[PDB]
Design a protein around this ligand. Sequence first.
Ligand code: C8E
Length: 707
Amino acid sequence: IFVTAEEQVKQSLGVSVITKEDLEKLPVRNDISDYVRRMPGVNLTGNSATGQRGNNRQIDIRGMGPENTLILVDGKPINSRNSVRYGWKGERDTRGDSNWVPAEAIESIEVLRGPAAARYGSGAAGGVVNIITKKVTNETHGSVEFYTSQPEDSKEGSSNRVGFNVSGPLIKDVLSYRLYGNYNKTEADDVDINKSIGSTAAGREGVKNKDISGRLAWQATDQQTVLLDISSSKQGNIYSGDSQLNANAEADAILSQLIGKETNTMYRDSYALTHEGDWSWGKSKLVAQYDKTHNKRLPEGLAGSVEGKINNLDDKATSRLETLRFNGEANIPFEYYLPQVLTVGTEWVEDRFKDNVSTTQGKDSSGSGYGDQLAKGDRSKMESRIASAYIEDNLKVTDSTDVVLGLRFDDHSKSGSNWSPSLNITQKLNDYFTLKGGVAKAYKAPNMYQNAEGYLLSTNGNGCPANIESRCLLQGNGDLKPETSVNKELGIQFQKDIVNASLTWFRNDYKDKIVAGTHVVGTVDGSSTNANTGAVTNTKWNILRWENTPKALIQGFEGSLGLDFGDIRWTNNFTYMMDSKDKQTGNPLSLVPIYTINSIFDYDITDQLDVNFVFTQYGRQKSRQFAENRLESGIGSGGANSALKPSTVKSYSTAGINVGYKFSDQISTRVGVSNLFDKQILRDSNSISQTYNEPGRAYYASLKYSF
Ligand SMILES: CCCCCCCCOCCOCCOCCOCCO
């Protein structure tokens, strides 16, 4: 049977595929990023290379930053983090969107890196993580699973899960369901975990997850199928003391009270309806989906020494993000000169966003604050629309040569239209080798804060670019161009039986990335009235705006190695990172080790008994190297002492073992330990390299009923 372009590029070098089986052999604590991170060209890093909110690490692909990692679930985009205020330097106080589907509910995970991911449009310049959930089943198969992790160190949080999955027929062979549920609670790290090295940065914040999700599958005709997906999730945090400038939580009037409490809460509801036709001329797929996300959390400083810190014990505000999305698509096999499979498709997406707490700034009772002049109209509501169409061909150019030619057109309501060409070649050399490559141009539309004229922020001086003197404002920009990136990869794939290997060069030229601008587009006079006196004072502000900056360069090598001896097996990879630099600042896009080596080992001792070993090795993580504002350039209010202090985390390694006993056909269980050598790093507030907590030694166990 025929093979579409989409299917074919999942044979690309920059693609890997995790199974339910892998996931079982190496249990996750909560967030799957802890297993996804082990793939070639993948990292776990903060939202920006500044290090702020460093324990908020999420899936990074080839060092392009997590804003550039598009998470999908069964093919449908998640975008809940856009709820969260995106700040002056690219920071967001989110944990991201790789934690919406409980580990035990996952059938498969597809990681697409580089050229193979540009297909999927806005936000895929880094890559795509496609979480594939368990399927409907024509006989009732059940699962219940528990998990616990138990850190040696008293100050690190233990974690606990329970969850179920059940699927069956309601009507044999025409209507069937899948339903899965999960309650996870990972306790926070103590407030004071990082103190023993003079550091005021918080440890990891905890999370209570509540997830429920339902699928109905209906075979309406011999050639027509209808899927319904309804899911709802709630994520409530457990506050560990985090704050953008790493204040001393325990000695802060307010924060000290919020510890161990829920200060932010993330709600997500999602509905999708899908129709799939199986026609004589080929195949078709229509999708409607609607997503509703609320972001409820305590308010915060939005400038100065209080920036990024909680103002208040009580007055929670909520932000509301609705997405409606439609997708239609057809696959037709035909033969003109060569065998082909033409894909042709349409996509429509609209976003509506309410945010009334971030979109207030420079409002003054005189009616002449800086924002009263620059931002008029309802600043609280933002719209985005993308209309897209694409065409794709999978050609057998020879019985040895498989080639994919795609083109994608995108038209965004603010940024304009944009073309994304996409080549992808597979070329057998012989029974054992094969050559592979792709070139693709990825897209990303501005994020809503970056676009929005009603979003204003300020510094008194320190945040200003080193070449400006006093006070700067940063406004959103409706006239931004979209982010574009030409992503190339090329490599060799080897496979005898028992042995396989790849090596692949990758290189992305990332263009017009949207960031805090450095040119003053003009100036404005802003009145600031004294609350109690009515005394006015006018301030000349320099106006900066979000702006696309010309070029960043990413480059490196991925290799992988597989050694299968039946009962004994080894899966290893490495990734070497030759280049991560913006050609203007000289800084890296995203803090990631210069190299990362991974090894997984499996040995089935008996049919029941199993042992499993994991080892990971990280080369050196350098900090940002070059100043981009007054403070960093040694001319802020703190002078030369507050100047940038580049530093680099020294390389290191961690390991883990399991013994995995299947007590029965029905009952499984797995006991193990992680960071076997207690290689434990604490987050240093006085550094811009040591930005995160590497958890120490932890004993964990998981048992699974299967009925
Ligand atoms: C072609 C790229 C592949 C990169 C990995 C190559 C490494 C080859 O190792 C094969 C055997 O792996 C043994 C795994 O066990 C680790 C033993 O040392 C334990 C350290 O505490």
